[PDB]
Structure 1
C-alpha cells in the first residue's frame, strides 16, 4: 500500500528528522510527510555527554512512533546522516565522534524501526544528494539540470553538471546512475565556509590583543553587543590558523553597522592568491565555469527570503542589505519582534556573507545572478540532501 522512511539530518546547528512516504512500489513518488526539529544544538555538542543523546532524540522519535501506523513500523528504515559539524568534531577527535555516533545508534536501535545506520556522510555525498533532491522535485529526471547551492552552519556546497567535464580535479567529479541516465557532476563542499564557521573565522581574524576585550565589527547593527568566549572561538578547527595569545578570556563584539566594511572584512577569510587550475572558487579549489540555472537552499533561502520579504536583482539585494545593516539593534528587534534574537542578530552578517560567497567566491556576477533561484520547498518537500538520500537508500 504505502511505505515510510525516516532520515535524521544531523547538521551543525540542529538535528532535523524527516518522515517520507511513498506508495508501495508496483510494476504498475516519495514525498515529505512530516518534519521534526530536535530541541537543542547539533549532536557534536554531546561529545562529552553522550549519555544525553537518547533523551535529546526522544521527542522527535516519539513523533515518529505516534505518526507511522504500528503495523508499518517494523518495515520502515531509519537513517541518521551527519554533516560538517561532525566532520569538525572528528578532525578534533576521532574517538569523540565515534562515541557520539555509537550513542545515536544505540538510541535509534531501541525504537520499533529498521535501523539502517548512523554515519557522517561525505561532503560530495551531501552535495550530490542535494542536487538529486532538487532535480527530482523539479521533474528534471525525465534535458538539462539545475545546479544546487547549499549553505549551513559549518560548510557550503556547490554541485552542477558543467559544460565540459575535465580531469582538472577529478576528486571534484561524481558520476552516478539515475533512471538509465548517467550523470557527471562537479561537486565541492567547502568545510569552515558555512555561515557560522565563517563568522568564527572573521572574529578570530579580526580580534586584537590590543583591544581591551572589545571588537568593533561592521557586520553587526549599530549598538549590537555580544560577549564571545575565546575558548569557544578557538574550539573549532576553522579558527586554528588565526590563534593568537589574547590577554583576555572573553571579548565583547560591538556592532558598527557598515555593509561595505563588512563586505571587505569577509573577503579577508577568502584566499584568491593560489590556483593550480584553469580557474578556482577560493582557497585554490577548482571550479568549472558556471553553467545553467541553480537552486539555492537551506540557509541560502532562509536568509535571502528574509531580505526579499523586506523589498529582485543583485543591486537591489545589496541595497536592502546595506540599509538593514545600518539600522540600530534596538530598532531591528522592535521591527521584527517575533524573530528569535539568535537568528535576527545574524542577518546583516549572513546576508553580506551570502552575497560575497555567490558573487566573489563563485562569480555569479551580473548576467549570472538571475540564474539563481532561492528555494525552500518544492511540491511540499524540503529542498536539502535528505530526500535524495532516501531515494538512494530506497534503491531508487
Structure 2
C-alpha cells in the first residue's frame, strides 16, 4: 500500500523532520516519493547541545510525536528514520571530535527508542549534501527521463554548488562525484564551501572588521541605519570560521551599529573571499576549482528564502541590486514597522544576506550578465522542499 520514511535534517540553524510517503513499490507500476509533512524542531541546531546531550531526547520529542501520531501504527516498525547533520556539526567536529560523537550517540539513543526502523545518525559529507540536493531538484523537475539543472544550496554554515559541466576533467577529481540513477551513470562537479553559509560569512566579516581601537563599537554598512546589536567576542571567536581573524581585543563584547550602505557592504563582503591563488584553469574563490558554468540552476534554501523576500518587494541582476541597495538604506525602525510580522532575527539580516547572495553568485560563481537568468530560485517543487533530504530518501529506499 503506502510506505513512509522519516529524514531529519540537522542543519546549523534548526533541525527539520521530514516525513515522506510513496506507493509501495509493486511490479505493475512505478510511483513517486513525496513530502507528506514537515516539522521544525524548536531551538537551535543540535551542535548547541554539545554540553547537554542529556537534553537531546527532549529536544527531538515534539517532532518525533508528530511522526508517531501521523504514521499509522501498523506501518511504523517498517518505516526508516535517518538523521543527517551538515556544516554546523562539521564545525563542531573540527572543534572537538568527542563532542560531535557524544551528540550523535545521544541522537541515536533517542531515535532508537521510537517504533521506527533506525537507519542511522551521521554527519553527511559536503559532496553528499550537494549531490543529494541535485538529486532532489532534478527528480522533482522530472529530469531523470536530456539535461539536468545545477543546484545552489545556501545555509547558515556552508554553501554548495553542484552541476554536470560541459567537459568532465581530472582538474580536481576530488570535486567529481559519479553515481547511477535509473540506468544512467552521472558525473557531477560538486563542492561545499565550509564557513561560507550566510551566518558564518557574517561572523567572518565581523571578525575581520572589528577594531581593537573602537571602544567596543563596530559601524557596519551591512545593517540598517540605526540598527544596534551587541556581540559577545567569545561567541564570535567560538567558531573555526573566524580563527584566521582572531586578535586580542580589549573588550569582551561590542555593539554593531548599522550604517546602511549597500556598496560599502558589498566591498566589505568581498574581503572575506580570497581570489589570489588558483592552481587550476579557473576557480570560485579560495583557490577552489570551478568548471565553467553550464545550463540552468535551481537555487534553494536560503537562496530562495532571501531572494523571494526581495522579489516580493518588487527580476534582473540590475533590478535586484537596486532593491537591495534601497532596502539597506532604510532605517531599522522603519524596516520593523514595514514588516511587522517578520521575526527580527531574520529581518535584521536581509540587507547583509541579500548583498552576500549577490556577491557569492556574481563574483564567487560568475553568474554575471547572460548567466543571471539561468538561476531559478525555488523553495518547493510539486510540493516537496527543495533540499538534500528527498534525494537521501530516494537513495535510502533503493530507488
Report if TM-score (shorter chain) is over 0.5: yes
Any idea what SS the aligned residue of 2:174 has? Answer: coil
Aligned Cα RMSD in Å? 0.2
Alpha-carbon distance, 1:274 to partner: 0.2
**Residues 275-308 of structure 1 deviation map (CA, whole Å, 9 limit, x = unaligned):** 0000000000000000000000000000000000
Alpha-carbon distance, 1:113 to partner: 0.3
In 1, the alpha carbon distance for the partners of 2:53 and 2:356 equals 33
Give the ranges of 4+ consecutive aligned residues of structure 1 lying more than 4 Å apart after TM superposition.
none
Q: How many residues align?
A: 396
**Residues 202-247 of structure 1 deviation map (CA, whole Å, 9 limit, x = unaligned):** 0000000000000000000000000000000000000000000000
Any idea what SS the aligned residue of 1:3 has? Answer: strand
**Residues 130-177 of structure 1 deviation map (CA, whole Å, 9 limit, x = unaligned):** 000000000000000000000000000000000001000000000000
Alpha-carbon distance, 1:117 to partner: 0.4
- Please name the residue that 1:176 is paired with: 179
Any idea what SS the aligned residue of 1:290 has? Answer: coil
Alpha-carbon distance, 1:52 to partner: 0.4
In 1, the alpha carbon distance for the partners of 2:125 and 2:301 equals 18
Alpha-carbon distance, 1:257 to partner: 0.1
Alpha-carbon distance, 1:61 to partner: 0.1
Query: TM-score under structure 1 normalisation?
Result: 1.00
Alpha-carbon distance, 1:265 to partner: 0.1
Alpha-carbon distance, 1:7 to partner: 0.0
In 2, the alpha carbon distance for the partners of 1:9 and 1:309 equals 28
In 1, the alpha carbon distance for the partners of 2:54 and 2:228 equals 35
Any idea what SS the aligned residue of 2:47 has? Answer: helix
Q: Which runs of 5+ in 1 are unaligned?
A: none
2:224 to 206, 221, 226: 221
In 2, the alpha carbon distance for the partners of 1:136 and 1:125 equals 16
1:19 equivalent to 2:15? Answer: no
Any idea what SS the aligned residue of 2:170 has? Answer: coil
In 2, the alpha carbon distance for the partners of 1:196 and 1:59 equals 27
In 1, the alpha carbon distance for the partners of 2:334 and 2:33 equals 44
Residue pairs, 1:100-119, within 5 angstroms = 100-119=103-122
In 2, the alpha carbon distance for the partners of 1:22 and 1:50 equals 34
Q: Which runs of 5+ in 2 are unaligned?
A: none
Alpha-carbon distance, 1:331 to partner: 0.1
In 1, the alpha carbon distance for the partners of 2:27 and 2:4 equals 19
Alpha-carbon distance, 1:315 to partner: 0.1
Query: TM-score under structure 2 normalisation?
Result: 0.99
1:394 equivalent to 2:397? Answer: yes
Any idea what SS the aligned residue of 1:171 has? Answer: helix
1:209 equivalent to 2:212? Answer: yes
In 2, the alpha carbon distance for the partners of 1:185 and 1:196 equals 27
**Residues 39-63 of structure 1 deviation map (CA, whole Å, 9 limit, x = unaligned):** 0000000000000000000000000
Alpha-carbon distance, 1:180 to partner: 0.4
Alpha-carbon distance, 1:192 to partner: 0.1
In 2, the alpha carbon distance for the partners of 1:6 and 1:290 equals 34
In 1, the alpha carbon distance for the partners of 2:91 and 2:161 equals 19
In 1, the alpha carbon distance for the partners of 2:315 and 2:87 equals 31
Alpha-carbon distance, 1:191 to partner: 0.1
